[PDB]
Design a protein around this ligand. Structure first.
Ligand SMILES: CCCCCCCCOCCOCCOCCOCCOCCO
Ligand SMILES: CCCCCCCCOCCOCCOCCOCCOCCO
Length: 772
């Protein structure tokens, strides 16, 4: 709607970048097309579509309107067949904004290489949950979003930490606006499983091996969370929502110019949720605040400062799973879904805050430069207490384990990178060159030396949490770990023919972990990136890529010889076809992929049976493992009011024993979410539904009292979601989400330290949203 403009005549490139910014729109244009042209002048309050054609007057260019993006083209009377994936310079370095897109398919993405590219242009598997997907299905945190992310599996560690798999691996890579955090372990990583969606536009998941931009990390995927940004027109909303088990949420979101001109601009959000739970004596309050100002130092240099804050504060936390699998004498426990072995006072509170600043500058080259500075904090306060062990006993008694960890991790990050186009053999290519540095320092207290506590409870079947709290005594331990990561990376994207694009890149990495453990050092490790995309028609392209990642091992993973295991490493091999329909409004992909892992830490049973090096007491073994699997997906418009996201993934991961692994992650899964917007008499109603199926999953767990291994299975099952919205008024709407319609009872954890967790029963959520 009607924006305030001011673009004086200049290089058409500069104008287009200046426009994207002022319009809150992404502008894509091909450098060689706009290079010897200038904009015509525009001034005043205008509608962006009128505005742009006025800007383009005299230039001979056409506009393609596409949601939150415009692409500019310069048609010739010539043309010999088209360059569908021609080098395109872009006005927003993170991609197209999904807020208000009306869509479940992303626009353009930078998660792969730092280069702004469409899913069809990216030679990796990239899934995105958009802002509208999030709104329609009430996905209010990262757990909700992973549960709705095709190809991800969410399993429980305990009431306050989940695990995300892809392709056989636990995901342990998180970025925010494309900047990796340190996630070496749960010390560094407080709150990562729990971020509220209130401050984010979309989460984008890059599946495979993602070393190129993550640096040191896990195989499986990177999760990239893009923050909400300020806008040039005023707007916002308030939201109220009320759900099953005394689940209350509120949320405020405000955005706009802060000066009469528009040269300073801000966005603020605050969200608060207080919920109980189907689980007995578990409650959890969450708080979030967020604020960001953008300042135009001048028409091609912008400074951003912002901060965010999230507190997650539960009662009734468990340490591991909701209940023990086996009783004192070895029989499987049968307990209600409400069972919670957490104590009343038990809490794993987790907090996160960031202070951050950017500087982004446009060189009249058409090259853009960007510096990103971060102060991150990840803190935890964890007085835990939870029935654990083979219980109850015959007289219905049980025993509690209690320990207390507190601590904070402080992180500092510098990320700097240049990106731009270049001519080579008569054609346009582009390149990114960046360097990065992060130092993060985990400091902590632990307590396990309980003074004079009676950790037995008189009654299991009716356990309440109603147990005393111990005297924690003095600290048992002080933690002091320091990680330093340093990167340099470079990727070229060569437009080789009119249907072939070749990716040649790499990261060199220096990684040092310091402190109470023997220093862990990796110098000059190379991480290769090779990719290709071949256009087939107006619609389909094939792609192949070879990609890599590593993580230096945790310091307790030493071998026979008391020598740290080589880094845990893998390569992703992928070949696929990707389809594009309705000018980018609908995307399909079908991929085959193979992960080759090497140096996967494993127990070393033959040494462990009777150790023989005085140096080590419990060695590990570095083995190879494989993932073989295929994946298909669709997202976007199936017909005018009709949006979907859906996926199908098949996997089996084996290790050098030949035995299946990550067998809790099902071998097959499907997701399908959809909504429909009626027209005519009922254009104000949006109706929606969803299904997630997964096939058999299992775990070998050891039944101590009987001295035998057992197989625990989860037979395949469906979960059904439904959804409706009614826009009663221009400014006000109502919603209902029913989740797990058929109240399926199933498991989200079997065998995590010999325990189990249930999935959510059927739950409802009612919301109003009010847009100013
Ligand atoms: C070193 C700490 C850094 C702190 C950075 C946080 C910045 C906090 O900014 C919050 C303000 O956001 C602005 C909200 O935008 C609302 C604008 O509407 C203004 C009123 O409009 C009147 C006429 O249109
Ligand atoms: C174990 C739970 C079993 C419950 C199953 C329920 C399935 C049926 O749900 C139907 C819900 O219909 C209720 C309609 O109520 C209207 C809500 O509209 C929101 C009002 O907005 C407030 C206006 O300011």
């Amino acid at each position: 709607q009607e924006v305030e403009f001011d673009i004086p005549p200049q290089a058409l490139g500069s104008a287009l970048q200046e426009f994207g910014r002022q319009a809150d729109i992404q502008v894509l244009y091909r450098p060689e097309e706009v290079r010897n042209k200038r904009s015509s002048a525009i001034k005043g309050k205008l509608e962006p579509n009128q505005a742009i054609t006025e800007l383009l007057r005299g230039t001979g260019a056409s506009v393609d309107f596409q949601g939150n993006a415009i692409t500019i083209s310069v048609a010739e009377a010539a043309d010999s067949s088209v360059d569908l994936g021609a080098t395109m310079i872009t006005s927003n370095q993170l991609g197209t904004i999904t807020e208000d897109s009306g869509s479940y398919t992303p626009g353009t993405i930078a998660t792969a290489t730092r280069l702004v590219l469409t899913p069809r242009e990216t030679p990796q598997s990239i899934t995105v949950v958009t802002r509208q997907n999030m709104d329609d299905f009430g996905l209010n945190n990262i757990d909700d979003v992973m549960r709705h992310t095709p190809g991800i599996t969410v399993s429980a560690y305990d009431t306050d930490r989940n695990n995300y798999y892809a392709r056989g691996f636990s995901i342990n890579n998180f970025q925010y606006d494309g900047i990796p955090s340190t996630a070496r372990n749960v010390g560094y990583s407080a709150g990562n499983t729990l971020s509220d969606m209130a401050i984010y536009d979309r989460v984008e998941v890059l599946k495979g091996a993602t070393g190129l931009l993550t640096g040191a990390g896990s195989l499986g995927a990177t999760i990239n969370l893009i923050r909400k940004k300020p806008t040039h027109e005023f707007k916002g909303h308030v939201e109220l929502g009320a759900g099953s088990w005394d689940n209350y949420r509120s949320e405020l979101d405000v955005s706009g110019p802060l000066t009469e001109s528009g040269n300073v601009r801000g966005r603020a959000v605050a969200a608060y949720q207080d919920k109980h739970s189907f689980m007995d004596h578990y409650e959890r309050k969450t708080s979030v605040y967020y604020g960001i100002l953008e300042f135009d130092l001048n028409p091609d240099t912008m400074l951003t400062v912002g901060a965010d804050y999230q507190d997650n504060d539960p009662k009734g936390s468990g340490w591991s799973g909701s209940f023990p699998l086996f009783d004192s004498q070895g029989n499987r426990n049968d307990v209600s879904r409400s069972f919670n072995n957490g104590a009343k006072w038990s809490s794993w509170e987790q907090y996160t805050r960031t202070v951050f600043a950017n500087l982004e500058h446009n060189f009249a080259n058409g090259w853009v430069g960007k510096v990103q500075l971060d102060h991150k904090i990840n803190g935890y306060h964890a007085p835990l207490g939870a029935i654990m062990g083979d219980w109850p006993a015959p007289d219905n008694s049980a025993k509690i384990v209690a320990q207390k960890y507190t601590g904070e991790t402080k992180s500092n990050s510098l990320d700097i990178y240049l990106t731009g186009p270049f001519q080579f053999l008569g054609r346009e290519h582009e390149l990114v060159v960046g360097t990065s540095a992060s130092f993060s320092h985990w400091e902590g207290k632990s307590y396990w030396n309980l003074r004079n506590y009676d950790n037995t409870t008189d009654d299991f079947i009716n356990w309440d949490g109603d147990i005393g709290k111990p005297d924690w005594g003095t600290p048992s331990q002080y933690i002091d770990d320091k990680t330093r990561q340093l990167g340099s990376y470079m990727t070229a994207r060569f437009n080789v023919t009119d249907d072939l694009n070749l990716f040649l890149g790499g990261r060199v990495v220096d990684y040092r972990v310091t402190g109470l453990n023997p220093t862990i050092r990796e110098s000059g490790r190379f991480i290769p990136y090779v990719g290709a995309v071949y256009d087939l028609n107006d619609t389909y392209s094939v792609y192949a890529s070879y990609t890599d990642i590593f993580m230096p091992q945790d310091s307790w993973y030493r071998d026979s010889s008391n020598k740290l295991l080589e880094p845990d490493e893998g390569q992703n091999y992928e070949i696929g076809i990707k389809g594009e329909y309705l000018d980018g409004r609908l995307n399909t992909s079908l991929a085959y992929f193979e992960i080759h892992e090497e140096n996967r830490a494993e127990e070393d049973a033959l040494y462990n049976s009777k150790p023989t090096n005085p140096a080590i007491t419990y060695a590990y073994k570095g083995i190879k493992a494989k993932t073989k699997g295929y994946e298909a997906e669709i997202s976007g418009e199936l017909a005018p009011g009709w949006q979907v996201q859906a996926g199908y993934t098949h996997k089996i991961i084996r290790d050098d024993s030949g035995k299946k692994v990550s067998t809790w992650e099902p071998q097959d899964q499907l997701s399908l979410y959809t909504s429909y917007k009626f027209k005519g008499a009922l254009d104000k109603l949006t109706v929606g539904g969803g299904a997630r199926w997964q096939g058999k999953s299992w775990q070998m767990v050891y039944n101590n009292p009987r001295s035998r291994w057992e197989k625990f299975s989860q037979e395949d099952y469906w979960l059904v979601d439904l959804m409706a919205r009614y826009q009663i008024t221009d400014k006000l709407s109502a919603s209902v989400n029913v989740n797990n319609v058929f109240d399926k009872t199933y498991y989200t954890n079997i065998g995590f330290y010999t325990s189990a967790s249930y999935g959510d029963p059927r739950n409802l959520m009612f919301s109003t949203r009010w847009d100013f």
